[PDB]
Structure of large stokes shift fluorescent protein:
Amino acid sequence: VSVIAKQMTYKVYMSGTVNGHYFEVEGDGKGKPYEGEQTVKLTVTKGGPLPFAWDILSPQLSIPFTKYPEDIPDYFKQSFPEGYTWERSMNFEDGAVCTVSNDSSIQGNCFIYNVKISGENFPPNGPVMQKKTQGWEPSTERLFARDGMLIGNDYMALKLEGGGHYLCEFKSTYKAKKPVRMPGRHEIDRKLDVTSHNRDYTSVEQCEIAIARHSL
């Protein structure tokens, strides 16, 4: 898909506010876009240490690195070099809500992501503000096309200290900056893991695998 090489890097800039706490994050990532493998190294650049669970941030930190089979049009890769934007809602089980937006573009063999996040109404003694989360379970996002955009839906779960999970609904709208060949209904199977962190989570490393496939 041309503008996109077998081996790509990326820069992500993230900023936002969670329960009134302002922060900024910067990351340098790298991966194999046609293999769906990705890794990124993150630094909390303002407002650290964060008084909330790192995990709510991890999934806002790279869709062109999704392995698409030949028979499903790759909406994200096609959008380049112009790029795309998206809006996401995360609706957690205890009433907390996160809204996220992104703008993506490209500089040669390096993507640039500008991510913004607003997280409100996490209970002060809940697992997010008390840092009791221990990573996301693997998940499968289901996507369909509407008016030239992709609409995604994913029921996610955060692992908790001393067992059990904290459940979340993701709803995402992805919008390419120019018309592309539209896929049908499909889904993307992903596993996201923090592979490395320092004590206060001001330096984090993450890896993701993402694999697109037909839906049933």
Remarks:
- The radius of gyration is 17 Å.
- The first strand starts at residue 8 and ends at 18.
